[PDB]
């Protein structure tokens, strides 16, 4: 796919090195158009960053911090949408790249940590927001840079703060630059105007002729002056196409404005206008994709099978939140109080955080850690939209074997931007999700767990969909121990996919199942109970059904279907006693009913009506 | 008084669906039995399914057994017959049908029984 | 399955006539046998169930007898009421089992 997201970090700290640079990779690897922000922060020495050269648009803002490498490739990048920017003033952020300043006495010959030089030889566009460069001891040229240029003249927040200290004598622009600013050294990286070198009014054009002037709604250069020829479209591209809106899906008549369908209708999605949405957003009826549908609308599964927004007559459904969705919006975890919310909650919208205080307990607030017993709350709940946070679980429970149907987690809301779920701090042995089977969109991280198995085992590409998802390994108790003490699954699990020890848990299995359990066989003709089978599940024959081995015992659940009844006939049913037949449908009980030789539950032939005191040596009420 | 109340007969055209719906009114349909029966025109009566609501257990006739499905609803008290794919054959007065409860299986109370011509 | 072969569906007579009919199950059925009236137009009603025991609201007239698989509905007197297609239904088995009808007319 040529549309990825990107993480929402801000200036936090890895998890881990050697999982944040493959986080890094999974997210960006040929990504073109990068929905949300972009952030590079602690990058080490020596950085592979080619996996940036095919990325053209950033939708959000891009951000650099604290990093020891001393080239960042981005010469593809031309646009900076600014839609969320950081610290509400910047989308181009580049600071604290070089060393502490702090001893790191560099040996002869050695580069000292630092970025040497910007090399950006296409961003010729900011939408929104400012830059902020400073704290750079070896950065050069940033000085010599025409930044009113690259900034959009609706950008009103032309501010800059930029920093001019460094270490280094820099090396002159090359001669073939012209106007002396130079990105680089090389004859190539002189900045090119698109802005100051315009006709009167053109916002961007090719070069110093009027013939130059760009389409009105291009983005930074254009190839020709026809809106199929920006090099970015400013608003929506519409199939190759730079326009202001996305056609509308239903076509008014002027009279009525009664609805009728447009074919040609288009969705949006991003800058983009989409035939149909997305996997994992939700296709409301104004015609944008979504995440969290309107008021007066709620998730309805569509014939297609997929999820959309439709309108509700009645009041909506009582959709159990959970947490920072609506109104537990700022709620950080699960104390004693929300958790009674959940019960009865077959779905949850929002995510479930699981701070170790949750387990851990606060005096302020008099809540005591929960307890490992009162986790019934959340026993019937099957979908989850958003992440699941985990950082405390009771030592009582040897693993996560609460949510035994929670069949659906969608990433419509990442822990960071990035991440779906999240498994750290824990002392868990495995996890036993036995019906997890859907995981929207984000990365799943276990993170720090020193008693944890069940990792490489997991049947991880059948839950995922698209191809930029991926699992981070990081902390995990090592697999080899894992394999030597043997903590895998066993032969009826197909493919050996499983979640935790025990026959219990399988995602699928050749032979039958009775409930819980991968069987080796049904019981049909052999075995204690009497089985019958049915979708490769073995249901127990009818107590009455005789059970007669040789003989198929019963065809399926009711009495009717017993080869035999072992006690008496009460046609067409099998019964361990002839019971006593009834005169009406309103209940009484004459008796009236005796069972005969060979147990045709025969009614009495005598009658009495008086309910005589009488009794025959059969059952039957006796005539005075 | 013990009443059987058939709903959703008429016309229907072929390989297209349609819904009949059962409501009991004077007794409890939670311990009984339900049976849906065809009255197909000039000829004798036949038997289509079976269906116990206090566990819904379902029992289909073989010749329209995988077309038709049947459900029912206790707190609604009532039970529903959703039949696919109709061919020209299913013309005919649909009929809703009891049982005695306990000791007594003779079809005691019927339904009014609806039409249902499949003639495109 | 289990199937009812009925009498021959023509029993024209008149009022007060004793009418018989026969149904004769392909199996042994034991008396698990229903007839129910149908004039045409309304609904069936069980009017004898278990081949012997009269139901309620059911003139006595009307009467069951049962003989091997061999069961024979018997009208002492005849009705003009007494006009309808009856059927000796079985329920020995899961799907229960209808005859062909015995359409009796009216001898007039």
């Known amino acids: 796919t040529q549309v990825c997201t990107g993480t929402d970090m801000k200036l936090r700290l890895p998890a881990s090195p050697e999982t944040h640079l493959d986080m890094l990779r999974h997210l960006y690897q040929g990504c073109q158009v990068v929905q949300g922000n972009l952030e590079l922060t602690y990058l080490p020495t020596n950085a592979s960053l080619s996996f940036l050269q095919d990325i053209q648009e950033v939708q959000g803002y891009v951000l650099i911090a604290h990093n020891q490498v001393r080239q960042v490739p981005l010469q593809r990048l031309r646009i900076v949408r600014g839609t969320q920017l950081f610290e509400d003033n910047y989308a181009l952020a580049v600071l604290d790249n070089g060393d502490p300043l702090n001893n790191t006495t560099p040996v002869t010959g050695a580069s000292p940590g630092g970025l040497r030089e910007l090399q950006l030889r296409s961003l010729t566009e900011i939408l929104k927001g400012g830059v902020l460069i400073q704290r750079n001891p070896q950065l050069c040229y940033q000085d010599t840079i025409l930044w009113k240029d690259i900034f959009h003249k609706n950008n009103q927040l032309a501010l800059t703060l930029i920093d001019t200290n460094r270490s280094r004598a820099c090396h002159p622009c090359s001669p073939m630059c012209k106007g002396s600013r130079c990105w680089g050294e090389s004859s190539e990286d002189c900045q090119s105007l698109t802005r100051t070198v315009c006709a009167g009014g053109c916002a961007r054009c090719k070069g110093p002729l009027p013939t130059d002037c760009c389409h009105e709604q291009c983005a930074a250069g254009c190839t020709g002056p026809k809106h199929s020829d920006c090099l970015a479209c400013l608003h929506f591209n519409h199939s190759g196409i730079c326009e202001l809106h996305c056609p509308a899906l239903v076509t008014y008549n002027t009279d009525t404005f009664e609805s009728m369908p447009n074919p040609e209708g288009r969705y949006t999605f991003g800058a983009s206008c989409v035939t149909a949405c997305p996997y994992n957003y939700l296709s409301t009826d104004v015609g944008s994709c979504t995440l969290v549908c309107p008021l007066h609308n709620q998730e309805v599964t569509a014939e297609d099978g997929t999820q959309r927004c439709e309108k509700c007559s009645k009041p909506c459904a009582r959709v159990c939140y959970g947490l920072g969705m609506e109104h537990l919006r700022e709620v950080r975890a699960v104390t004693s109080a929300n958790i009674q919310e959940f019960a009865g909650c077959k779905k949850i919208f929002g995510s479930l955080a699981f701070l170790p205080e949750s387990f851990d307990g606060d005096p302020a607030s008099n809540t005591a850690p929960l307890q490992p017993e009162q986790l019934q709350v959340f026993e019937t709940l099957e979908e989850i939209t958003g992440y699941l946070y985990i950082s405390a679980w009771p030592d009582s429970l040897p693993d996560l074997s609460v949510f035994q149907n929670l069949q659906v987690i969608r990433g419509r809301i990442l822990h960071n931007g990035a991440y779906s779920l999240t498994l750290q701090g824990l002392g868990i042995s495995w996890l036993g999700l036995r019906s997890l089977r859907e995981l929207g969109s984000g990365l799943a991280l276990i993170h720090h767990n020193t008693h944890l198995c069940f990792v490489h085992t997991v049947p991880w590409d059948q839950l995922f969909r698209n191809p930029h998802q991926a699992l981070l390994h990081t902390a995990n108790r090592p697999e080899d121990e894992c394999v030597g003490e043997g903590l895998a699954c066993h032969q009826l699990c197909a493919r050996g996919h499983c979640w935790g020890p025990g026959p219990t848990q399988c995602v699928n299995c050749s032979q039958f199942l009775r409930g819980q359990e991968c069987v080796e066989e049904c019981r049909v003709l052999q075995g204690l109970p009497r089985e019958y089978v049915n979708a490769r599940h073995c249901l127990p024959c009818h107590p009455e059904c005789q059970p007669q081995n040789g003989s198929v015992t019963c065809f399926g659940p009711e009495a009717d279907q017993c080869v035999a009844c072992a006690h008496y006939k009460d046609p067409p049913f099998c019964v361990a006693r002839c019971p006593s037949g009834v005169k009406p449908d309103l209940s009484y009980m004459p008796i009236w009913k005796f069972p005969d030789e060979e147990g045709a539950c025969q009614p009495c032939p005598i009658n009495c009506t008086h309910s005589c005191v009488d009794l025959d040596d059969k059952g039957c009420p006796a005539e005075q | 008084e013990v009443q059987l109340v058939e709903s959703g007969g008429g016309l229907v055209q072929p390989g297209g669906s349609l819904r009949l719906s059962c409501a009991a009114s004077g007794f409890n349909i939670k311990d009984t039995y339900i049976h849906w029966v065809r009255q197909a025109p000039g000829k004798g009566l036949e038997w289509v399914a079976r269906i116990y609501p206090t566990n819904g257990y379902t029992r289909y006739a073989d010749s329209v057994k995988g077309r038709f499905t049947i459900s029912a609803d206790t707190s609604k008290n009532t039970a529903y017959l959703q039949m696919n794919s109709l061919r020209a054959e299913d013309t005919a007065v649909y009929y809703c049908?009891?049982?005695?409860?306990?000791?007594?299986?003779?079809?005691?109370?019927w339904g009014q029984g609806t039409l249902v011509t499949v003639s495109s | 399955d289990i199937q009812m072969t009925q009498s021959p569906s023509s029993l024209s007579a008149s009022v007060g006539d004793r009418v018989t009919i026969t149904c004769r199950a392909s199996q042994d059925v034991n008396t698990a046998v229903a007839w129910y009236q149908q004039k045409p137009g309304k609904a069936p009603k069980l009017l004898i169930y278990?081949?012997?025991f009269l139901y309620s609201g059911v003139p006595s007239r009307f009467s069951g007898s049962r003989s091997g698989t061999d069961f024979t509905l018997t009208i002492s007197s005849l009705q003009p009421e007494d006009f309808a297609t009856y059927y000796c239904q079985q329920h020995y088995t899961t799907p229960p089992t209808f005859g062909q009808g015995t359409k009796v007319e009216i001898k007039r």
């Open positions: 278990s081949a012997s």
């Open positions: 049908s009891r049982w005695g409860g306990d000791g007594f299986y003779a079809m005691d109370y």
